[PDB]
Amino acid sequence: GANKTVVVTTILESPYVMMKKNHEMLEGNERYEGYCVDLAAEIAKHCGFKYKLTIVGDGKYGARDADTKIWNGMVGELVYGKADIAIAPLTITLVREEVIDFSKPFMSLGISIMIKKGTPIESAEDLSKQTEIAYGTLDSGSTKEFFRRSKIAVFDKMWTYMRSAEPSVFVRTTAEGVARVRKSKGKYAYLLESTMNEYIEQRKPCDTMKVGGNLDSKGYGIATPKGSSLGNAVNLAVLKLNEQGLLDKLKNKWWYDKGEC
Amino acid sequence: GANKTVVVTTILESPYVMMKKNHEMLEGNERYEGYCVDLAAEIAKHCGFKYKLTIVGDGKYGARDADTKIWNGMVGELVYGKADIAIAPLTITLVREEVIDFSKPFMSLGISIMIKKGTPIESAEDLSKQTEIAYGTLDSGSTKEFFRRSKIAVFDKMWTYMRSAEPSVFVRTTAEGVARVRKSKGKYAYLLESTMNEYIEQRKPCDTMKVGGNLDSKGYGIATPKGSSLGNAVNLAVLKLNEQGLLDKLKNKWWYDKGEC
């Protein structure tokens, strides 16, 4: 049938999608800036579609409730037909690939440790062998699921602590986790994807850092509903953008050219 | 129909697939060892197939001849029906994804510079601004195509030199490129994937090293003929193996546990 405007679901996560200063009271795609905003414009150009950027209503990446079996987050928006594509830092995982389609990855990353500068922690193993410094992850995402599912001794030990810690060590958004590190006087460390860790390390007040290697290796992909005819073109477009060096240009633009430290 | 033994095409490239010592005169899959041999056994177990490992007849990864338009290498074995799957360090690229299917990546890598220790080169830009030290890549692969196609000033400059250099700066196999670095007294540098560079750096005689950052970011995938029904299960299997930490275990086993330096 006739061309239709593609509904894009995404999430407010710096530096992927951010509200431009003084654009809050305005309308349309032009309100937003970031790596994924630029990436959306390129995918749409190469695939030949018009699009509307929307922020996921529940502010979540996507997980399946064990009770209701209902998917939430951006994943849920695709699964239930509320959006046509997700262009966001959405991690490719087995349980998600069973219900939605993903392009080849547009960025690599791994889970990493964020600390307030001077915290006496260098590794996951260090966190796991002590009790003075609390630590946690984002809720409703792949990082939490990594720990929940791990059979690796250090990570299993970490999960056993995290799952029963009071008050909750989990946070609703990256920003909350970062604020909690900064206000903790060193007594909270945040487990998050290396991409966001590395970005925050380059922002004022320049009081956090990434420590240790990554805990795993994975990627973000552009997601479409299962069997969507958009998937083929989107996938080829990601591969073209990588080979043209466009994805590398965008990474430098939004991480390191914007550096404040 | 009835189950059939899956023909696996792969390539003799250390430490992915290697002939075991004293197994040359023997028969069957047990002759070979390496990261991809172990990976094949896991994919086959998770997908539920029996398989026969075969080494690609022409010893190439795969490129399309501009004249005949015929694909060679492992890609050609899939395209023309000679094999059912490729389990090898086969780089996911746009031109390949147009003719074969790839799983999500099982390993990340980038093009990198190998030098003989003491060579006064720290970067691609350094190579491009001088003439005393020759440099080249493997033929019939993604590294060569990267330079051929690049619009980035430094890489375009490098291609312009490489394509007309005499004697040829290209080599037939990784081993030839490595031997050429070692025998060059510093006057040849080899451009190759970071995975192989990092492996060689840990082997006797411990006279080479990787210098500088990677030139790009990409991945290896398991490849199947376009539209193959094996593709779905293979893809889910790669994602499972990554999440179980199996791929990381295999990397350490074949790179760093085997380290001789």
Ligand SMILES: N[C@@H](CC(=O)O)C(=O)O
């Ligand atoms: N990017 C992740 C968020 C996280 O859990 O760190 C996701 O897709 O769930």
Ligand SMILES: N[C@@H](CC(=O)O)C(=O)O
């Ligand atoms: N792994 C590469 C080989 C190379 O060109 O470095 C390929 O698939 O072509």
Ligand SMILES: [Zn+2]
């Ligand atoms: Zn504006």
Ligand SMILES: [Zn+2]
């Ligand atoms: Zn473009």
Ligand SMILES: [Zn+2]
């Ligand atoms: Zn447990």
Ligand SMILES: [Zn+2]
């Ligand atoms: Zn044996």
Ligand SMILES: [Zn+2]
């Ligand atoms: Zn397994």
Ligand SMILES: [Zn+2]
């Ligand atoms: Zn040129």
